[PDB]
């Protein structure tokens, strides 16, 4: 079908999208320490 191709299309690009480690900046610190 059409959505079947789209579903597997996302799978192919998802394999190479998990090779990077991301570290976000959370608004927290040792304020109480």
Partner 1 sequence: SFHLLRQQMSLTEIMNTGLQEHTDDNCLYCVCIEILGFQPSNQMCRILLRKEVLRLVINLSSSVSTKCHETGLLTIKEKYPQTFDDICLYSEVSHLLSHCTFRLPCRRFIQELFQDVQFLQMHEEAEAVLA
Partner 2 sequence: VGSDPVILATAGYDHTVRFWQAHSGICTRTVQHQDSQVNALEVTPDRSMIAAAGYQHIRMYDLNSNNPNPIISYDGVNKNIASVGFHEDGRWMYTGGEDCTARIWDLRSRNLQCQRIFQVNAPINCVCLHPNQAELIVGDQSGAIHIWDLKTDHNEQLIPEPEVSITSAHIDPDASYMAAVNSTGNCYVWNLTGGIGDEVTQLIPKTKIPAHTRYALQCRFSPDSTLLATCSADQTCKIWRTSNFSLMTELSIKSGNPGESSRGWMWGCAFSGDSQYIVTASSDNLARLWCVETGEIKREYGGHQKAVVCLAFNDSVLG
Q: Is 19 in the site for partner 1 (CB under 8 A)?
A: no
Query: Does residue 1 bind partner 1 (CB under 8 A)?
Result: yes
**C-alpha span between 31 and 12 (Å, rounded):** 44
Interface residues for partner 2 in 3-32 (CB under 8 A)? 19-25, 28-30
DSSP H or E run through 5? helix 3-15
**Two structure tokens written together for 2:** 């059409």
Binding footprint of partner 2 on the chain (CB under 8 A): 19-25, 28-30
Binding footprint of partner 1 on the chain (CB under 8 A): 1-4, 6-7, 10-11, 14
């Amino acid at each position: 079908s059409n959505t079947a191709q789209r579903l597997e299309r996302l799978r192919k690009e998802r394999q190479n999208q998990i090779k990077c480690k991301n570290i976000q900046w959370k608004e927290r610190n040792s304020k109480q320490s």
